[PDB]
Amino acid sequence: VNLERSYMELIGAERETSRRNFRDLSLRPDVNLVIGGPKYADCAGGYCYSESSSLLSATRNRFLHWTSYADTLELVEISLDINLVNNAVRLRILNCSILPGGVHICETPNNIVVLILTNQTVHRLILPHPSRMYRSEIISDSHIQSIFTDIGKTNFHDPSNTYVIPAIPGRAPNTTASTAWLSSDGEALFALPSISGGILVIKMPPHDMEGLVTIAELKQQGPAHLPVSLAVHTLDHDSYLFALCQDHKLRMWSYKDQMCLMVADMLEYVPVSKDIRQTAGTGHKLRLAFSETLGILYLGVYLHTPKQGQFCVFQLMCAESNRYSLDHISSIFTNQETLIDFTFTLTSMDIWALWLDDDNQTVVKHINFEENQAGQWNPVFVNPLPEDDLAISDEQEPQEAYLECLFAPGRFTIAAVQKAIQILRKGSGRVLDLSWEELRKDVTLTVENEIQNAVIDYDVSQEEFRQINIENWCKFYTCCLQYQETLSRPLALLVHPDTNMVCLLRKGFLSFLAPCSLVEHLYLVPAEHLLTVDESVISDDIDAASDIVNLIQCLRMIADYISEDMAYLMESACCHLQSPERVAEQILEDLIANDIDNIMENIQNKLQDTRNPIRAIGFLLQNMDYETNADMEQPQPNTRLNLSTLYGSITASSVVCQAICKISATRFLICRDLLILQHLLLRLGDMALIGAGQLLHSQQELIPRAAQLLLSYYMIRWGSQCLACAVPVDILESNLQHLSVLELSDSQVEKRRYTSGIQTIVELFFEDVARKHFPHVFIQSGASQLQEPLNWSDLIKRITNYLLQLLWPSNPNFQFAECLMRNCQYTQLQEYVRLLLPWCQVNVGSCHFMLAQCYLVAGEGHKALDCFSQAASPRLQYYNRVLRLLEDVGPELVIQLATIAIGEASDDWRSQAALRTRIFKHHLDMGHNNQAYDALTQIPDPSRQLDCLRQLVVVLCERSQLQDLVEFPYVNLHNEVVGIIESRARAVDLMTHNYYE
Amino acid sequence: MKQDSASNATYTVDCEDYVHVVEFNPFDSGEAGSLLAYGGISYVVIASCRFQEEDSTVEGIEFKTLKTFHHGERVVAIAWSPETRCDALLPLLRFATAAGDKKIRIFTSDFQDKNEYKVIEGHSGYINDLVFCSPEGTDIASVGDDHTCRIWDLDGKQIAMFILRSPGMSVAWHPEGAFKLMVAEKTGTIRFYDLTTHQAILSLESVQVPLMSADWCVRNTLRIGAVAGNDWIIWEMPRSSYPQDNKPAHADRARMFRWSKCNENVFATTGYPGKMKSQIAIHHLAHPQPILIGTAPVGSGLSWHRRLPLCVVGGYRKLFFWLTEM
């Protein structure tokens, strides 16, 4: 079992400039606006279809999520596989406030039913199940509609889809507990706490039958009995209602019998204090999970106590006399963080929970409540909010730096930038759906207008102008960061039971959780949780495991003291091709120069406890290495058509490529700290802590390898953060024409989709090239059995590692540079091949071919020669190509280049001959007799001199240069020339020919 | 189907080798003829051109090669120095060239036996264009595929380096306003850098990519001309960063753009050397179609006469001159 302890957050960037076209629907129930009603905090949740783990089902990789604030509901359907058309709805129930946790989705074999609870009305929507919308397997991926396409046709005013809650017995005021479900007969039921402390159950008739809504009140009652959290479980004809109330007691209700069957005091399991029994439990929550394969129902309950929370998981046990009891499985404590939501899965037996720390930061953890020997919560590495201050170098212009930070992939959402703009202009102008480029130009123009308005005098100093620029852009950035902070608030968690797909639902965007690799897990886990890492997972050698742990500790002690200046110096050294070894040495000298807190002595002490530090270095540099061998077998074209759409949506591309980005960033940091630590071990090896031969190995093989890995991860990081440029269609078509000449365009032009979204060059490569090879990665892993369910963790790990192997620019197919010559982004191409070529050894010939094409396009044909020839006699072949071009003109150049080609000629005498013929022809047409003759004698063909000479004499007799003809010294074939002339002249007539004369 | 009548070159001058780049002298040299430098496969030739439109004593064109400089590498871009003079008091010939070896070679001469050249190194990628970036001719600015615009003085030292986001494809000095250098990145972004603050003042964006050339209008320092993909683009500052005009220049990849030095409305763009003969299409701002279309069978390099309405395209062993009737 791969104990994937730590997870990392991948932001599923909603980078589409056009807001998902939220089909605004306003529902007007006959209820008056209550001025002064309770304000409910924003909530969210998700629903995952059944059979979503199946590879052949039509709900594969599909899930619904929704956010609900005061009187609005925003439903969205997402598919990691294919982009869904019309996959967003904004339902506005006017005068009614949607409850926290009052939206429940229930599934039927034909429909998807959404049950919405409000403070005054209850609703029911009916949408077609995805397996029923599509009757034909031949559907282009471009038009697969979401189930929200036909929500405008459902009558929301139908009294069977809308009911108003009466005031008596009515619902309790200020209560958020609510549950709803579909019975076995199809009836929609809505439960909620009554004013009298019980449960109020409002039952609707089935959607296809006429009937009257029925209202029932379950009663066992002061405000102490008021349910805080409600959950339901349907058992074969009945709906078991569970009530976790204010008085710290869980109550199980039967709706069919309308009787409470179990009463359980929640305080018998907590380390009771006398004060709790007198305080109402307003913070408790309740979640139920059912294991069909075992027939077991698990109860995960959270107990909010002002001093310490507690997670308690229970198993429901039914005695033979229909007496139900709870069995204690586990009790887990938590810290003083304020819980927001929590779900627990029955496939992995994990409790996923989301908190907020005392700094209001997002904290997510997960724990296995069956194998919990240590009471430790495994961390989730949540992406931090952007930094408050942006450091600007004195050589860097503030405009470019601030634009690059604001518009960097994954930092800021479109809504935050748009809101900052809206407030900066103080205008109520309708914000169109502005593209990212138009949004950038709008930001630039607005802050430039603010700058020009901040400049009052005409004689401003250049330093003063720079300061005003920095100030204005910093104000804009601070507003953007405020609104990104508001849009990044956590709301709830959505975990998938079958695919283990975990998602974190934020107010403004969706973020996916992915399993973290061992290197990054050890590097990023806090110091307090590193001393408890199970050393069996790292290696079978306990000693090697302890070595790697101590090494990672020191790696962090170096990182905890690298200021922003040293990190920027290393990044600049990587940019300007400086040697990162000497740069790491300089950073080490500055660190030892600033060792105020004796951190260096501690690093020495901790390296002393390491037995084989070089073995740990070699282990780290092996796990961080994706240098593949050339055994990437090419795809056989018999892949089943059903796999071509796997992970093909913009969301899946963005998530995988953010995985690449975060992995490259973390491992870049690791290789930087590792280079610093290696120079440290060099400086320390002199005082006999490492042997002479070991030190020789470290300085000869390990430091250049770490430097190459660091340059490689900087390369992949830059590639994952560099934005692709918009290429018009005319230029792309002229380009694909230019390459049909070179025969690199095998793939038919199958309507290249308008990429109206922002995509990095890594994302463009993923969508065009790396995604077509995922079927074979799936097939090669022993997945010939089509019955295995899709696993999010394993699939994302394999996909990220394969995309890193391709993005470790070693891909023998070599389609990134072939494409960047195919597109007209020759720029990122020359940069890619340049930053790439020194250190990666596969595709050297292909890199050189593509660099030659870039130089051919830039107008530099001789360097195209050199790079075509390193790419591959081939030199002679390119010489022949260049000779064709010079001959098209009409030929001293042609002569000279052909002469160089003679020296290089080892294979094509035929090509030599044709070029010589062309030279002779040109010269004769121009009038150069002698040069033509020389080109002629050189021709390696058997009898061209003869034919060429016939041509010569005919052309000459016509040009009438007969004195020159008389003077020409005929060769040994003098008698031959004379004879030919005579023959021809006597054969032809006398009137039209003066050849006798 | 109107067949565009390819215009024959008004004057044709034979050379010794292929002309990879050709550049008139945009400054005053003190002579009656307008100097001309064209870089071959391995040389750099300086010539003096006198046309019939200047002197009625010249029948056609009078082409005299003044000096032949040995280069050793293919010349890809030539920049003239403002100190270039042919006066008999103290002649001084200075110019900067970039080659296929990523190095800059500052040639100095007095047209007598004194000939010196200096190699400046530091570019990690090929150089695409270079110009003299000071009115005194003291500094040299070059842009290339290492994503950098560097400022070299005459002694080979680097004064400043501005990091671009993409290969600079053309760099031009502001004709009147000092310390403003224009750098045309390939992905369409035109940047204006301030050589005293080492900061970027303003950026322009072309609607099409890639941006293969950019040039200032000497007669109207507000108009900027460029070629991006197939279409020529014109901006007018400080109005807006958006194009003012955008019309197709060539059927396949317009490459070079050069504003006329005598007319603020005429500019010539050369088609890319490829499947078709390299076409020159001289435009007029008032006309929707080119006023003159000539076919240079293989042509790289384009430069406009300082006084006449006459443009040159170095071809294959030939300099093709085209006169645009005003």
Short mmCIF file of N, CA, C and O in Angstrom, two decimals, chain A residues 762-774 806 813-816 819:
data_model
loop_
_atom_site.label_atom_id
_atom_site.label_comp_id
_atom_site.label_asym_id
_atom_site.label_seq_id
_atom_site.Cartn_x
_atom_site.Cartn_y
_atom_site.Cartn_z
N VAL A 762 3.35 24.59 -22.26
CA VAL A 762 3.21 23.23 -21.74
C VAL A 762 1.79 22.73 -21.95
O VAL A 762 1.57 21.57 -22.29
N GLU A 763 0.79 23.61 -21.76
CA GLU A 763 -0.60 23.21 -21.96
C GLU A 763 -0.90 22.97 -23.43
O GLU A 763 -1.63 22.04 -23.78
N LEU A 764 -0.36 23.81 -24.32
CA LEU A 764 -0.52 23.58 -25.75
C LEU A 764 0.12 22.26 -26.16
O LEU A 764 -0.46 21.50 -26.95
N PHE A 765 1.30 21.96 -25.63
CA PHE A 765 1.94 20.68 -25.91
C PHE A 765 1.11 19.52 -25.36
O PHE A 765 0.94 18.50 -26.04
N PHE A 766 0.57 19.67 -24.15
CA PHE A 766 -0.27 18.64 -23.57
C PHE A 766 -1.48 18.35 -24.44
O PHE A 766 -1.81 17.20 -24.70
N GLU A 767 -2.15 19.41 -24.90
CA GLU A 767 -3.39 19.22 -25.65
C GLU A 767 -3.13 18.70 -27.06
O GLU A 767 -3.89 17.88 -27.57
N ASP A 768 -2.05 19.16 -27.70
CA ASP A 768 -1.84 18.77 -29.08
C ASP A 768 -1.12 17.43 -29.22
O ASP A 768 -1.41 16.67 -30.15
N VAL A 769 -0.20 17.11 -28.30
CA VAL A 769 0.74 16.01 -28.50
C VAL A 769 0.70 15.00 -27.37
O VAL A 769 0.58 13.79 -27.61
N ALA A 770 0.82 15.47 -26.13
CA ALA A 770 1.00 14.55 -25.01
C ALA A 770 -0.29 13.81 -24.67
O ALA A 770 -0.26 12.75 -24.03
N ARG A 771 -1.44 14.35 -25.07
CA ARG A 771 -2.72 13.73 -24.71
C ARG A 771 -3.04 12.56 -25.64
O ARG A 771 -3.76 11.64 -25.24
N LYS A 772 -2.53 12.58 -26.86
CA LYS A 772 -2.79 11.50 -27.80
C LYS A 772 -2.11 10.20 -27.41
O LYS A 772 -2.50 9.14 -27.89
N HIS A 773 -1.10 10.26 -26.54
CA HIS A 773 -0.35 9.07 -26.15
C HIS A 773 -0.79 8.51 -24.80
O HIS A 773 -0.19 7.53 -24.34
N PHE A 774 -1.80 9.09 -24.17
CA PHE A 774 -2.28 8.57 -22.89
C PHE A 774 -2.99 7.22 -23.01
O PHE A 774 -2.91 6.43 -22.05
N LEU A 806 8.07 13.54 -21.17
CA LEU A 806 8.01 14.26 -22.44
C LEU A 806 8.53 15.69 -22.29
O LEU A 806 9.19 16.21 -23.19
N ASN A 813 10.08 11.32 -30.03
CA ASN A 813 9.18 11.76 -31.09
C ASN A 813 9.50 13.18 -31.53
O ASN A 813 9.44 13.47 -32.73
N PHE A 814 9.85 14.06 -30.59
CA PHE A 814 10.26 15.43 -30.88
C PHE A 814 9.18 16.24 -31.57
O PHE A 814 9.34 16.63 -32.73
N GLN A 815 8.05 16.48 -30.91
CA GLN A 815 6.97 17.18 -31.59
C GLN A 815 6.77 18.59 -31.04
O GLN A 815 6.04 19.38 -31.65
N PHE A 816 7.41 18.93 -29.92
CA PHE A 816 7.30 20.29 -29.41
C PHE A 816 7.98 21.28 -30.34
O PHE A 816 7.39 22.29 -30.73
N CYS A 819 6.42 21.37 -33.68
CA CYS A 819 5.21 22.18 -33.65
C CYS A 819 5.54 23.67 -33.63
O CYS A 819 4.85 24.47 -34.27
#
